[model samples]
Target: MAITKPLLAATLENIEDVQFPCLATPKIDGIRSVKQTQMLSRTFKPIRNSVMNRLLTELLPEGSDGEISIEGATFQDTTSAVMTGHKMYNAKFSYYWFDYVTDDPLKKYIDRVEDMKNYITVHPHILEHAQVKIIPLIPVEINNITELLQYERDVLSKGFEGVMIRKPDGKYKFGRSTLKEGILLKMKQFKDAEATIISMTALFKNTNTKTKDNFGYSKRSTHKSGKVEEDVMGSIEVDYDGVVFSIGTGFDADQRRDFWQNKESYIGKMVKFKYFEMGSKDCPRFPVFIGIR
Candidate 1:
């Protein structure tokens, strides 16, 4: 199976203050696909679900040039199918194809969705099939941030991940981009706050070149090293509203090293953090380090 990275979106800011009449979609919560015959995870690895395998091969049409970008069809059993390769969970696998990949010459996203529509027309059998369904890509006629917030609120109520804003005129970029033209964006209702770093933990270095070559790193920046100042900081503990969260994600190579070597300075310093939601114990869920506040 082929292993290729998919187009990832750049982090968006001031989303509520942006202009629009652009495309809006619910962020997909499942695995991503590299190609038509090569379904895979967010990282570089071949998905082992035979059920999903048969459909993309037997049903989904391949684009003449480029590849397909897909998601969905991920959850407990779905995750198990991809990870454990248990035949039992394979039957529960399903994925949604949303767009065509390839934009060296700037294939507009608005134009590609038309091709995506045609794909569904040719393989019209899946309309009645729950296991294989395409994600609904809506060209919203929305204006202002308030309306966008309302749109997101309505979507979130439906138990969706969040809202994804696309510039119809945007060209498909190979990697994360900050270009103004057709810049893609993701927005969520997650919490962000400035909190105090109360403590920290050590991190160990693990630079295994052969392993990365074999397994492939999913993260964009997966530097293999935690060794710093003889006691590398693995994570920092941040507190908000009397609740504490240990954040390990969102740190870069340099920040990790600096914070570890200067652990004393950070302990009482205020740092910004992001989290999905608060847990039962008032702790942040999936909290990640942001930066010094």
Candidate 2:
């Protein structure tokens, strides 16, 4: 069966700008995967009145009347270390099923998750060796943007990703789409950390030097204090927990000069940087250098 790509949300700059009555759910941080499950008898036959029988009884689409589909996601915060390649240690995984997909009303999906406890009780093996939960909606009445911002801040303060706003009556539209009808809106939380400078080098033709080489290293100089000071003009390599990457942007002219002036001092020192989210292999996504810590 074809699965929906999952609905995406636009960033809410001003929560007060949002027209209510809206629904709020935690915007989970992780990888997205479509999960489908069905019940079968001990004889491997499709079983009636199975575990999910009542919960999804009236929610399944026309032909999928016997199966359940979940829009799920997993986070790297608590699970990346144990999830190498395709193998996963369920106990170490932070899993959450955010949305349910079917031809039913949105509220039905939201209400059904609570009743899921009953289903799990009947089918213990359904989630064998797994750490999973249904992502719960923060059932709070958001009267205005200030309240929304406060709510978002509260969630972020607790170290969660952020909060999502959805229209209770919004339909489940697949893929990324802008909803003029207030389908979905998102607010993400950002964080910063420090990394030690490992090395520095450049790519393409050397900016400071007219020379070019295979290693992209060349002598460069700047006039400072009535004298010529030589340095390397290239990427700034940083490392944390054995992970290494280079940052070539986010520096002002004065910063560049100061960096060259005190290049040796930065080698083993920690510098602050910020990122919207984590990228592949646990790297910072869209990272920006803040300053030396």
Candidate 3:
């Protein structure tokens, strides 16, 4: 027998450069795990960490395609926490596999993944509960940037995260590296619109002992002296095309104080917001402020 070094795992980048004639797949937001097929060696076995990060070996019948890394969400009480800041009390977690790690070409890997799905589906635990399934492939062939962005919008409108663009014959890069050669690329569907700031919301850490007067008023006055200390944990509510949503993530300290100092002035003035497409309730998913229009 001969021994050689193993390939360490890695992550892919968003599009650093464009390569023509690429295959596309939906990008699922979740954790990642690799599965090993038993075909490589007679005695070879596959082992992986579960979504909980607990090490466990998944058993597959003999004469099966080798390992696959399971990349998807783990079911938990806080599964929907990313979409909504607060947890959903009865949230349901689901897994949609978007990519596989293999040396084979795109079509070859897709066929292999199909076989893996069929094998897993017959298992009572996987089938009855609908635990896992491969993500549906987008049929469009990307030859240009314009078509790519249009397809991206099409996928997001269907409640998908985004698209994974991969060269049909591109080999997988193990571990973390740039996809500047166009081997792999990710296009997240973000849309922007104008909104007006109507009000600000303050988040509290220790409300029991902390007074509302203990923070903002004092800090707001001293900020211009270069000791800028606006401590309201400020989030702004904005009205966009008659729909109102609040954004708290994008602003820096300077922007926060500016909002507080001129709070009344910003009312009815248009500011731009960037967010993924609207979700089930017609509210934007993960909205963030961009700039004033």
Candidate 4:
């Protein structure tokens, strides 16, 4: 709450779109909250998690107050546990902070991270079930995409979700860039979109697990786990705007039976799906069915 609200990252499309001379940090999947007189979210209401409120309340506010993102929770799990909708699943929390502002702003993210290391060595941190942590400094202003991407994969293999990337000289600013400049970028291995079921196909029988899912779209059906033969729907071709694609993932065994028996009912249904990216033929690449709308 000191310098400005945390600068947000724009979604990554092409890595080439990012300018060189940037830094990389862990892209936390948890909620973003600013550490101030109290730990608060972007909106008017305070964060609802009991652990955050209790631990953060007990600790006095420090000079190092700015931005933090949490870890150790799925969005669904945390929200449910926070509201008593269900029991928490792996619900311990860790807040990783990387930036803080002063009367004279460092502005440069490179110098700012360094400052946290210098003065705040062995920080006052942790709770019985929650913590305050320093975000890892990944690349030191790497100029190549390969180095950046390699580092990200390394982090992901170590249980990290995605890499939060920024420039070495990126200023400590506020608000999302309206035109989406190259200040901060978020790199995730996957993304998703919504489409409408346009076509359906029967799964081919008696193929080894080695068969290619497609030279186009769609893969095998959900019903072929033990029995090699099935009457279930293999994949459903979908349309988004004018682009048509097929999704073969995310069908449960029961859904496969229902869809094949009631093909007519599933047609024209809106579908939420995931994809790696847009690929050949102006269509979504590797479409995985999410759910119906």
Candidate 5:
């Protein structure tokens, strides 16, 4: 089935009973390449110390060419490539940012990555900064200006450069260059949502060290209730920094712990948690317990 945009950005609330559809996402190669393996033969040498050029050298070194496929979606090179025609306004851009970068992009790039199992279907929406996870987009396809500003702030906060708005919304077939209109844009300040632990971790810190079972133990760690904990799933545009578990859904201490003890056939298998949350540094703490948005 053709994956529409909304379905792609699941907005469901309760993740207790949900199922996700299969989607084609690229693999995270740990780092992106400067030249697509196919393009290596055509490249000569670096002409200038440009942003894209510098980024490529650091992120994509020699022997870094390979294919990596994740469960939810594939990782993207936010710095090098910018999609064309797809209008991304501030709100829309913010959502994309949170999915890729951390809640504190300026401070931590680790928070940006999320488990693919949370959402039923995930489309790779990579960007440079962490902010811009809140602003709304115009055409819902165009990256919003406010969103860009937020990302700029996040990148700069971490002692980095600014965002690069691409031209024509297409992959970088050639080397990085300003000659391509709208291909790159920079901002001094930007703000986007930060990713949070919406659900409990797959296992407790001291729990199953080797087998690592059970999940949804909010990161906030502030709960005198004892019986249950609460987590905020925050806004859609921001990173998935909201509460990991919904208080309303009711995840009793026993249920929470029991979910981890589960060793079913799909225990280790990845499952999608649709309309749940996004932005994790890793993938599928538990893939079987996911739903489509």
Candidate 6:
């Protein structure tokens, strides 16, 4: 094969743009931003924007969806957090209310500032209220899942919610800040011997509906529905609306070749995972190694 040298301009070289369907190892923890609080409180229930609403509805348990109840609501944890100062959850809500409660399109305003890198500086919502301001802090992407585990611990120790994992190509979006196009997954840890990957129901294309005896274009390649074989790369399950996701982000060309070589045994087969801890919904607080068993 002949190799050709390609050239690009400075802007093209420096510009960071994420690709579609970009999924990295998901950090195990829920994101409870200020918006989540208010969104849930206003109507006694929180419904994200249309896109986010659709996505989350897929992941949340159907019957469990209801108005925000104080029963499980946490209050004082975020009050003394380093970045957030000593503001309680209700206090934070008060700030958000005055700052963003308006008829104008806050999303558009935020988008403009973010485009200019003045995101932290002249945002309209921040400007709307003298007492309230917005400070954006995003977790830097890491390759290893272990780093994600540590990061979650660090953030939680500070009394905030867990970190949000972004794909290499992820861009900052408002309510739809997920790995891919609004694809969100939550993780929580469990100290169990074996990790349970329990996705009650998601809408994504699951392995369940696929052939039970085989996969691909063939009729018989060894099959099982709602089952998956595991590996380190692309093993984080995104169970959105019965759709189980496995993004192969860290896998390389050679690894891809090796994986395909064993497709017969691994493909369409469900693999077990070793758990450092477990979660209520079977979410791991950090990405767990696949096929550990």
Predicted model with the maximum TM-score: 1
Global fold similarity of model 2 (TM-score): 0.48
TM-score of each: 0.71, 0.48, 0.48, 0.57, 0.20, 0.29
- Relative to the unseen true structure, what is the C-alpha lDDT of residue 242 in candidate 2, on a scale of 0 to 100? 78
TM accuracy, model 3: 0.48
Worst 10 residues of 3 by lDDT: 1-10
**Ten-residue region with minimum lDDT total, candidate 4:** 208-217
Top model number, lDDT: 4
Quote the positional error of residue 178 for candidate 4 in Å. Answer: 6.0
Whole-model Cα lDDT of every candidate shown, in order: 0.62, 0.52, 0.50, 0.63, 0.26, 0.32
lDDT of 6: 0.32
lDDT of 6 by residue, 88-165 (tens): 333222111111211223233233223334432444453243322323332344445565556667766654433444
Single out the weakest 10-residue window by summed lDDT for candidate 1: 63-72
Can you write out model 1's per-residue Cα lDDT over 102-158, one digit (the tens) per residue?
333267777777766776677678555655544535456556677788889987887
Question: What RMSD does model 2 have?
Answer: 13.4
Worst ten-residue run, lDDT, model 2? 60-69
- What lDDT score is found at residue 131 in candidate 6? 24
Clashing pairs in 2: 16-145, 201-234, 201-235
What lDDT does candidate 1 reach at residue 291? 83
Per-prediction tally of clashes: 0, 3, 13, 0, 77, 26
Indicate the residue-level lDDT of 194 in model 2: 81
Tens digits of per-residue lDDT for model 3, 1-293: 11111222223433436677677766554433233432121122222223211111233333222122233323221233322333222223333433343334334434545545665667545333333333323335777777877887887776556777766555444332245545556666578788887887653333233223321222222333333234554788888778888888888778877777777787768888888662314577788888887
What ranking emerges by lDDT with the best candidate at the front?
4, 1, 2, 3, 6, 5
Greater-TM-score candidate between 1 and 3: 1
Per-residue accuracy of model 4 over 1-293 as CA lDDT, tens digit each: 26345566787868887777678776665555655556666542355664665565454234343333334454555455444423223344455555655544546767777766665555444322334444534345567888888878887887666787776777666666422566677787877678888879876565534433312224444455534646998889888888887888789888888889989988998988887541223676557788889
lDDT (10s digit) by residue, model 2, range 1-293: 22323455776755565877667766655544333343222222333323333233222222121112223323443333222333323332333444555444344434434334444466565445333333323345576777887888887775557787776666555544364656777776557788889876532332353453322435454323334334534457899657777666778767776776677777888878866763334677767788887
